[PDB]
Amino acid sequence: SNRALLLAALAHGKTVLTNLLDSDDVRHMLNALTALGVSYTLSADRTRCEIIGNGGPLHAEGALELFLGNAGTAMRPLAAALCLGSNDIVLTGEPRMKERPIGHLVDALRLGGAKITYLEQENYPPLRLQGGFTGGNVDVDGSVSSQFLTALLMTAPLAPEDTVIRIKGDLVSKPYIDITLNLMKTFGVEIENQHYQQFVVKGGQSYQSPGTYLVE
């Protein structure tokens, strides 16, 4: 649901994502893009959205603060996406989200050139981003949902510089990460798939509007 939302936001041109999940983890993702200025529109059942491709990373210059609540599926991907270019945003979430480690993620993007901080605790929702994600060799932990690598996999490709993420700990969503690139490729961007040890994303990419896509 949120994968297509974000991927569509970094793509050039508005695209559609059907079979979206009518929940709070998604509405938060959508609320996250609209915050920067992205233009999305769901269906009567909130299962089909049309996201206007920002053309680049979720660009927002105004110290924007978002609330990903208890999602975790949109807080990690959206966190890294904005790390590109130059955007000032402070992330936040629900009471439980306050204890959702996000260091392995924030660490990789940061290594590529991203500018983030901890407004409350280290490796938690309170994250102030400032863009700067360019690229370079990176090492990301697989454990704790693939939202970590999934974030860099969509963010790093658009990063002006070539990013090479590796997989420190055992991936928790091994087959789910393939969907990340499978989603990106369908859009217009592809990356290098190492021996499941590193995700080399050709820097300088830019997803394009595929059209009508089914989330699933």
From Swiss-Prot:
pH dependence of function: Optimum pH is between 6 and 6.5.
Compartment(s) of residence: Cytoplasm
Binding residues for 3-phosphoshikimate: 3, 145-147, 173
Regions that span the bilayer: none
Chief subcellular location: cytoplasm
Superkingdom of origin: Bacteria
Phenotypic consequence of residue 73 to I: This mutant is sensitive to glyphosate and causes a substantial decrease in the affinity for PEP. Is insensitive to glyphosate but maintains high affinity for PEP
Catalyzed reaction equations: 3-phosphoshikimate + phosphoenolpyruvate = 5-O-(1-carboxyvinyl)-3-phosphoshikimate + phosphate
Reported effect, residue 77 to L: Displays a 2-fold lower affinity binding for both S3P and PEP. Decreases the binding affinity of glyphosate, reducing the potency of this inhibitor
Gene Ontology CC terms, in alphabetical order: cytosol
Keywords: Amino-acid biosynthesis, Aromatic amino acid biosynthesis, Cytoplasm, Transferase
Residue pairs linked by disulfide bridges in the UniProt entry: none
Enzymatic class: transferase
Means of activity regulation: Competitively inhibited by glyphosate. Inhibited by (S)- and (R)-phosphonates analogs of the tetrahedral reaction intermediate. Inhibited by (R)-difluoromethyl analogs of the tetrahedral reaction intermediate. Inhibited by bromopyruvate.
Similarity-based family: Belongs to the EPSP synthase family.
Purpose: Catalyzes the transfer of the enolpyruvyl moiety of phosphoenolpyruvate (PEP) to the 5-hydroxyl of shikimate-3-phosphate (S3P) to produce enolpyruvyl shikimate-3-phosphate and inorganic phosphate.
Protein name: 3-phosphoshikimate 1-carboxyvinyltransferase
Residues of the full protein shown: 25 to 240 of 427
